[PDB]
C-alpha cells in the first residue's frame, strides 16, 4: 500500500475529530492515564462501536478485571457484551491470574499469550483488539529494559497479525512520565493520554493525542466527560467559524427595546445583557423567554442564580405567568448551582437539554455566575462553546452578566466576552436627586442601526418601561451625573 | 584542514539559519526530545533533502521502527523513500530486533553495526547517516558509565569514516535532563533539543541548538510546526530589520479618512485600528478590503471573531458586496477561532495563505482576539511575526484591536503593540447629551502629516461618515465630555 | 596590591577584574557548568593567552575530545594551536580512550596520568595546565568517596609540581549541585561556575566565582558572551562611578530646544526623551544625529523599532537627508529587533559598534523597546551599562522611551530610569478643542538652568517647531486641560 496512513473510526464522540479519522489501522495505540481516568472505558467502547457500527468482531484481553465484571460494568452504559459474546462478535480473553500460583514465569506467557490472542483473532476474524493494563503483566518484577522488549515483541506480533490495537497503561502522576516505565511511550506507534486533573477540589478529564506516527491530529488536551453514553469529548478548538447568518428579526419581549434595536433582535445572534445586580437583567430574560412562548416557540431558561420557585414568584410579580409556559410545553427551566459541576459538564448538560427540547430561544441567567472560581481561559472556552453551538444551531441566545461594580464600571464584561457577542444591552444605575434610577442602552448591534440614547427606565408590576434619555446631564455613564 | 569547521545544509526550512549554515560536516549531531517531538522526522528529512538537493546518498539506521513503516509514514509528507531505495540513493539499515529476542548484545553489535554501517556507507557512497533511537540499543540493561563508552565509540568510529551523522535520543521531561542517561550531552559534539511543551492544554513545539563545538549558532528556543511538508521552523529572532519603505499611498476605503491621513495610507505600512467593541473597527476593515478589489488587487481578510456568513450579512448592510469580491477572485476570507490552534500555527497559516494568493492588502480583524490566553511575550512575538513578514513583502496590512474598556482607556493597546505599528487610527465612544456617539482620530502617522482632529462619525447603510470635531468640549478622550 | 595570594592573569576579558587579578598561582581552579557552557573554551583560552602574552608554555589534558578536534575547534576563534604545538609552546596530552577498549583503568591511570603530566610539564617547562573533563575519567563506575580521593590526589600532586591548573567539570542542573559527584566543590582551591540559564526561551550565560581560598573577588553571577574572540565578560558591578564631567555644550539639532536647555545639551551627559507613541521622540533623535554630522562628527543611531529604510523615508520627509550622512561616513545606522538577542548581546554589540566607529554622539531609539519581556532588574542593568560606557567615553547619548499610556502618565518612565539620566525631555499630547496638540518640556537638567515652560510644538516637513506655553490652561499634564 503506497498511500498515506489509513484510520479506523472509533465512533467515540469527538475522538475521530481530534485523531483526524481515528486510530491508524493495523497499529497499536497506547492509552495511559492515572487510576479512574477511563482507560478501560475507551478500549471497550472501541470494540463495542466496532461491532455495532461496522460489524467488526473484537478481542478484549484483560489481565486484572474478570470477564464477568467487564460485562457487568459495561451495563453502566447500556452495553450488553454478554450478548455480543454469544453472537461471537466479541471474545473476552481472560488473562487474569488466580488466587494461587507460582513464579519465574516471565516472558513465558508473553510468548504463549501472543499465540492465545492470535488464536482468538483468527477464530473470530477479529479486526479490533484492546489489551487492558498490559502494565500489570510485567508488574511482577521487571526493569525498564525488560519491559521495552516484551512490549516491542507484543506490538510487533500484533502488527504482523495486522490487528488494530489499543493498549492500556497506568500512570501515577498527572503530568509526570507518560507511563509507569517511561518506556512504553517510545515503543507505541500512537500515544493517547487520559488525564483526571484535580485543581481546586474539582476534577477535569482531558484527553490528548500525543503522537500518531505517519499522520496529523489535533494537539494538546481536550475536555471530555464520562456519562451513561460513555466517553464524550468536546473539540472546542475544532468548531469551525462557518455559522449561518440571516436578517430575520425576533422580539425581545419589550417593544420599546425592539425599536431601539432597530426592529428587534436578529434570529441568528447572541445577545448580552450587562449591569450591576438589581439593574434588571433577570427581568429582560423572563420577558425574552415569554415572548417565544407567546409565539408558540420552545425556549429554555438556564438559571444559575435563582431557584425554580423564586423565578416563578418574581416572574408572576412582573405579570407574565411561567406556570402556563411550562404546561403548554413551550418553556423549559433548568436551574443548578455553578458549583454543582465543572464547565465541561455544564456545557454538555446545556447541549443535551437543547437536543431533547429543540429550543428556538435560549437564555442563560448569569454567565458571570458560571465564571465563579474557574480560570478566565477555562471560562472563555465555555462561552465560545455555548455561544457557537447556539449560533450554528439557528438558536437565538440571550446571556446575562453581572458586573463586579455598580456605577463606574469601565468595561462591559470583567471576563472580556463582549468581543464574542453580536448584540450588547447595557443596564446601569444613575444617581439622580438622591435616588437610584436605571437606564437601558443598546451598546451595539452588528447588523442593525439601533438607538444610541441612554434611556432611563423603571420597573413595575407590568414589567419594564423605557422612558427618555437624560439629555440635560453629563457624565451619565459614570453613574453620578451632573445636570447642565 | 586549516580553517574553522564546514557545515552541511539540511535544507530543513529555518534550521540552516538557526545553525548558521547547517550541521558540522564529518561529525554527529544529537537530536533528542520527548515522545512525538519529531526526532525521526528530522532524521529522515535530513537524509531525503540530502538526496533530493545535492544527490548525497544516505544511510538510515533504525533500531525500533520497521523499514516498511519508515517508508509508509514518510508518505505522510509526500516522501517516496521506496523509490530512493531502488535508485540506491537511500539505504535503510534494519537494526531492529526480531520477535524472538536473545540476550547480551552490547559489543558484537557495536563493531558489527559499524561494519554494516561502514559497509553500507561505502557501498552506496553515503554522505549522510542518521541513526534513529540509539537510546533503545543499550536500553537492554545498562548504566550511565556503560552508556558513555558505547556512545563515545559509536561517535568516534563514525567520525573516522567521515560520516556527517544525525543521532536520535529520547527524553522523559520537557526541561529535565537532555537525554535519558544524562551522559549523551557531553559525548556529542553537537546537541539539538526538540521540545513539545504543554502549558495550558496547548502544545508548543520548539527547537534549540544547545551547542555546536567549533562554530556559532542561534541560541535559545525556536517554535516550529510539523506539516505535510515536514518540519517548519520560524527564527522570529533572525528576521532582519531591513524592510523596504516607499512614499506611495493607498486608499483606506474611506475618502475622508484618506484626507485626515494626508492622502491615504502608505503602501509600505502597518495600520492599527483600536477601539471598544461596537466602535466600528470591523467596518473600517471591510472598507479597506473592498477598496483593494475596486482597484482590482487581491486582499485577504483573516477574521477571528465573526463567521464567514456574518461578515457577509454585515458587509452587505454597509453596502459593499463581499460576494462579488470572492467570485472575481480579488478577495479571500479565512475565518477561524484563535483557540483552534497555537500562535505558531496561525502565523504559518497566515503566511501560506499569503503565498498561495499573492495579496496586495491584508487585514486581521482583531489581534486582540488572538491574544486570548496566550502570554504577552508569545503574543508580541506573533505580532512581530505577521507584521515584519508583511513589511518585507510589500503588503499593506490593517490590524484590529479591541480595547478591554470602552471610554477611559488610557493606553492604545493593552498588549502594547502601538510601538510596532506605523499608523494608528483610534475609534472611541463619546457620551453626548445622553447619547453614545463615535469619534475617529488619526493618532499617528510616521511619514505623513495627518489631521489632528478628533472627528465624530456616524454609521449608516452607506457606511462611515466622518463629520466634525467637538471644538466646544473638554475631556473628550475620557468618553464623558464637558460641554462648554 | 593588598591581596595575600599571587595571581596569574588569564587575559580573558573581564575575568581578571572578577577574580581580582586572575587565578591564584600554584593552585587549581574548578570550572564547572552544564553542556555547552564554555568550559573548554575557558581552559583553552587560559593556556592560549598564557602563551601569547607571557610566553608561558601550557599543557592541555583531554579525556574526551581528540587533539585534532581541539585544534580544529580553536580555529573558530582564530587561534592556531597547531602552530604553538610545533614551536613547542603548547602540548596536548591525549588521555582519551580508544574506540576498541575494555573495562577498568581510572585508578593507576590516576597515577600513570600524574606521572605523565609531570613529564610534559617538565619537558615543556609548562606553567599553566588545564584538564578538560576530569569528570569523564571516573565516569567509569565510581562513587562519591572514590572520586574525592582521586581528585585530591591529582590536585595535590599538581600543587607540589607548582603548576597553576584549570580543571573542568560537568553539572546537570543549572542551579543544583556544583558538580556531578557533589564532591569536587570542596576539594578544589577555587571554584568557578559557568551557567547557561534558559528562562523564557532565551539563553543567558553567566560566570560566577564561588570561591577563592585566600583572597577576595567579585561575588555573584556575571553575564558573558562567547564570540569570535572567545569569552567576553561584563563586570557591570565593577564599573566605577568616576566618569569625567565638563560644562561643554552641544546642540540638540533644534535651536529652540537648545535655548530651553539653557544653551544646548552638555557634551558629557545622558539625555532622555519620553512620551507616548506619536509624540516625536524619533524625530528629535534624527535631528540629534543630523546635527553631529553637520559639524563633521561621527554618530551612531541604534534603532530597535523602525527598519533602516523606514528611518530614511521618514527622515527625508522631515528634511534632513540620511543618505548623505552615511556616505560622508559621519552617521552609522544599526537597526535590530530586541527579540533577536538577549540584553547581554545587545550591550556588547553596541559597545563594539562604538569602538569600530569612534562616535561622538549616540542615540538609542527606544530603550522601552529593549525592555520587552526582560525583567526590570536585567533591564536596569543594561541601561546602567550602555549609560555608563557612554559617560566614561565622553560620548553624548540621547535615549528614547515610549510611555505605555498616552496622556495621564504619572511617572516619567515605567522602568524607573529617570534617576539614571542627566537631562530629561518630555513630550506629550494635549487635548485642545477636539484636537491632539503636542507639548515639549525640559523636565530637568543637572548642570543648567533650562526653561520650565511646557511649550506646544508642531511637526512639519521642516521639522519640529517649538511655540509658546498654554498660560491660560489648567490640568495640562492631565492631557485634557480646562480653559480658564
Ligand atoms: N454511567 C456512568 N456515568 C458517569 N460516570 C461513570 C459511569 N460508569 C463509570 N463511570 C466512571 O468512569 C470511571 C471508570 O473508569 P474505567 O473502569 O473505564 O477505567 P480506568 O479508570 O481508566 O482504569 P481502571 O481499570 O484502573 O479503573 C470511574 O472512575 C467512574 O466514576
Ligand atoms: N414587583 C416589582 N415592582 C417594581 N420593581 C421590581 C419588582 N420586582 C423586582 N423589582 C426590581 O427589579 C430588581 C431585580 O431585578 P432582576 O430580577 O431583573 O435581575 P438583575 O438585577 O439582573 O440580577 P440580580 O439577580 O443580581 O438581581 C430589583 O432591584 C427591583 O428594583
Ligand atoms: N503530515 C503531518 N502533518 C502534521 N503532523 C504530522 C504529520 N505527520 C506526522 N505528524 C506528527 O509528527 C509526529 C511524528 O514524530 P516522529 O515520528 O517524527 O518522531 P518522534 O515523535 O520524535 O519520536 P518517536 O520515534 O518516538 O515517535 C507525530 O507526533 C505526529 O502528530
Ligand atoms: N446598518 C447599520 N446601520 C447603522 N449602524 C450599524 C449598522 N450595522 C452595524 N452598525 C453599528 O456598527 C457597530 C459594530 O461595528 P463593527 O462590526 O465595525 O466592529 P467593531 O466595533 O470594531 O468590533 P466588534 O466586532 O466588537 O463590534 C455597532 O455598534 C452598530 O452601532
Ligand atoms: N566563534 C564562536 N562564536 C560564538 N559562539 C561560539 C563560537 N565557537 C563556539 N561557540 C559556542 O561555544 C560553545 C562551545 O563550548 P565549549 O566547547 O567551549 O565547552 P563546553 O560546552 O563547556 O563543554 P563540552 O566539552 O561538553 O562541549 C558552543 O556552545 C558554541 O555554540
Ligand atoms: N512630514 C510630516 N509632517 C507633519 N507631521 C509629521 C511628518 N512626519 C511625521 N510626522 C508626525 O510625527 C509623528 C511620529 O513621530 P516620531 O517618528 O517622531 O516618533 P515617536 O512618536 O516618538 O515614536 P513612535 O516610533 O512610536 O512613533 C506622527 O504621529 C506625525 O504626526
Ligand atoms: Mg441575574
Ligand atoms: Mg468585529
Ligand atoms: Mg520610533
From Swiss-Prot, chains A, B, C:
Changing residue 58 to A: Lowers the amplitude and distords the waveform of the circadian rhythm. Residues 102-109 are annotated as: B-loop, required to bind KaiB and SasA. Changing residue 381 to E: Constitutive KaiC phosphorylation. Changing residue 418 to D: Poorly phosphorylated by itself or KaiA, mimics phosphorylation of this residue. Changing residue 240 to H: In kaiC7; extends the period of the circadian rhythm to 40 hours. Mg(2+) 2 binds at residues 282, 305. Changing residue 74 to V: In kaiC1; shortens the period of the circadian rhythm to 22 hours. Changing residue 95 to E: No longer binds KaiB, no formation of KaiCBA, still phosphorylated. Residues 475-484 are annotated as: A-loop, interacts with KaiA. ATP 2 binds at residues 277-283, 318, 438, 444-446, 448, 450, 452. GO terms for molecular function: ATP binding; ATP hydrolysis activity; DNA binding; identical protein binding; magnesium ion binding; protein serine kinase activity; protein serine/threonine kinase activity; protein serine/threonine/tyrosine kinase activity. The active site is at residues 64, 305. It catalyses: L-seryl-[protein] + ATP = O-phospho-L-seryl-[protein] + ADP + H(+); L-threonyl-[protein] + ATP = O-phospho-L-threonyl-[protein] + ADP + H(+); ATP + H2O = ADP + phosphate + H(+). ATP 1 binds at residues 36-41, 76, 211-213, 215, 217, 227-228. Changing residue 102 to A: Abolishes the circadian rhythm. Interaction with KaiA stimulates autophosphorylation, KaiC interaction with KaiB sequesters KaiA, preventing it stimulating the KaiC kinase, leading to autodephosphorylation. A KaiA dimer is sufficient to enhance KaiC phosphorylation. Interaction of KaiA with the A-loop stimulates autokinase activity. Changing residue 144 to C: In kaiC2; extends the period of the circadian rhythm to 29 hours. Lower CI ATPase activity, clock slows down. Mg(2+) 1 binds at residue 40. The KaiABC oscillator complex constitutes the main circadian regulator in cyanobacteria. Complex composition changes during the circadian cycle to control KaiC phosphorylation; KaiA stimulates KaiC autophosphorylation, while KaiB sequesters KaiA, leading to KaiC autodephosphorylation. The Kai complex controls chromosome condensation, leading to a transcription accessible chromosome during the first half of the circadian cycle and a compact, less transcription-accessible chromosome during the latter half. Clock output pathways impact the RpaA transcriptional regulator. The level of KaiC phosphorylation and KaiC ATPase activity represent the key features of the biochemical oscillator. KaiA homodimer binding to the KaiC CII domain stimulates KaiC's ATPase activity and forms KaiA(2-4):KaiC(6) complexes, which stimulate KaiC autophosphorylation first on Thr-419 then Ser-418. Phospho-Ser-431-KaiC accumulation triggers binding of KaiB to CI to form the KaiB(6):KaiC(6) complex, leading to changes in the output regulators CikA and SasA. This is Circadian clock oscillator protein KaiC. The gene is kaiC.
Amino acid at each position: 500500500e503506497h498511500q498515506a496512513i489509513a484510520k479506523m473510526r472509533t465512533m467515540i464522540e469527538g475522538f475521530d475529530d481530534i485523531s483526524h479519522g481515528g486510530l491508524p489501522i493495523g497499529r497499536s495505540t497506547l492509552v495511559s492515564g492515572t487510576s479512574g481516568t477511563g482507560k478501560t472505558l475507551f478500549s471497550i467502547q472501541f470494540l463495542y462501536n466496532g461491532i455495532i457500527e461496522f460489524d467488526e468482531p473484537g478481542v478484549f484481553v484483560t489481565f486484572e478485571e474478570t470477564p464477568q465484571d467487564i460485562i457487568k460494568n459495561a451495563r453502566s452504559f447500556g452495553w450488553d457484551l454478554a450478548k455480543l459474546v454469544d453472537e461471537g462478535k466479541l471474545f473476552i480473553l481472560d488473562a487474569s491470574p488466580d488466587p494461587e500460583g507460582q513464579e519465574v514465569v516471565g516472558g513465558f506467557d508473553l510468548s504463549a499469550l501472543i499465540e492465545r490472542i492470535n488464536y482468538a483473532i483468527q477464530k473470530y476474524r477479529a479486526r479490533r483488539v484492546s489489551i487492558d493494563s498490559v502494565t500489570s503483566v510485567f508488574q511482577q518484577y521487571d526493569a525498564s529494559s525488560v519491559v521495552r522488549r516484551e512490549l516491542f515483541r507484543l506490538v510487533a506480533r500484533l502488527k504482523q497479525i495486522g490487528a488494530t490495537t489499543v493498549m492500556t497503561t497506568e500512570r501515577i502522576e498527572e503530568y509526570g512520565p507518560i507511563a509507569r516505565y517511561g518506556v512504553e511511550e517510545f515503543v507505541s506507534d500512537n500515544v493517547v493520554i487520559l488525564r483526571n486533573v484535580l485543581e481546586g477540589e474539582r476534577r477535569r478529564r482531558t484527553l490528548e493525542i500525543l503522537k500518531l506516527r505517519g499522520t496529523s491530529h489535533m494537539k494538546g488536551e481536550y475536555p471530555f466527560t464520562i456519562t451513561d453514553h460513555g466517553i464524550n469529548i468536546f473539540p472546542l478548538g475544532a468548531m469551525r467559524l462557518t455559522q449561518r447568518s440571516s436578517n430575520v428579526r425576533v422580539s425581545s419581549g419589550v417593544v420599546r427595546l425592539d425599536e431601539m434595536c432597530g426592529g428587534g433582535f436578529f434570529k441568528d445572534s447572541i445577545i448580552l445583557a450587562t449591569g450591576a445586580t438589581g439593574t434588571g437583567k433577570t427581568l429582560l430574560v423572563s420577558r425574552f423567554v415569554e415572548n417565544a412562548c407567546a409565539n408558540k416557540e420552545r425556549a429554555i431558561l438556564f438559571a444559575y442564580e435563582e431557584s425554580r420557585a423564586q423565578l416563578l414568584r418574581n416572574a408572576y410579580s412582573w405579570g407574565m405567568d411561567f406556570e402556563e409556559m411550562e404546561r403548554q410545553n413551550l418553556l423549559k427551566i433548568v436551574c443548578a448551582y455553578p458549583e454543582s459541576a465543572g464547565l465541561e459538564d455544564h456545557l454538555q448538560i446545556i447541549k443535551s437539554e437543547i437536543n431533547d427540547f429543540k429550543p428556538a430561544r435560549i437564555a442563560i441567567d448569569s454567565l458571570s455566575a458560571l465564571a465563579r472560581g474557574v480560570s478566565n481561559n477555562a471560562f472563555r472556552q465555555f462561552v465560545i462553546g455555548v455561544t457557537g453551538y447556539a449560533k450554528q444551531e439557528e438558536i437565538t441566545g440571550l446571556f446575562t452578566n453581572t458586573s463586579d461594580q455598580f456605577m463606574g464600571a469601565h468595561s462591559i464584561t470583567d471576563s472580556h466576552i463582549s468581543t464574542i457577542t453580536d448584540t450588547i444591552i447595557l443596564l446601569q444605575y444613575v444617581e439622580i436627586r438622591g435616588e437610584m434610577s436605571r437606564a437601558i442602552n443598546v451598546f451595539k448591534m452588528r447588523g442593525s442601526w439601533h438607538d444610541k440614547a441612554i434611556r432611563e427606565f423603571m420597573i413595575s408590576d407590568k414589567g419594564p418601561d423605557i422612558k427618555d434619555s437624560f439629555r440635560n446631564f453629563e457624565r451619565i455613564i459614570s453613574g453620578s451625573p451632573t445636570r447642565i
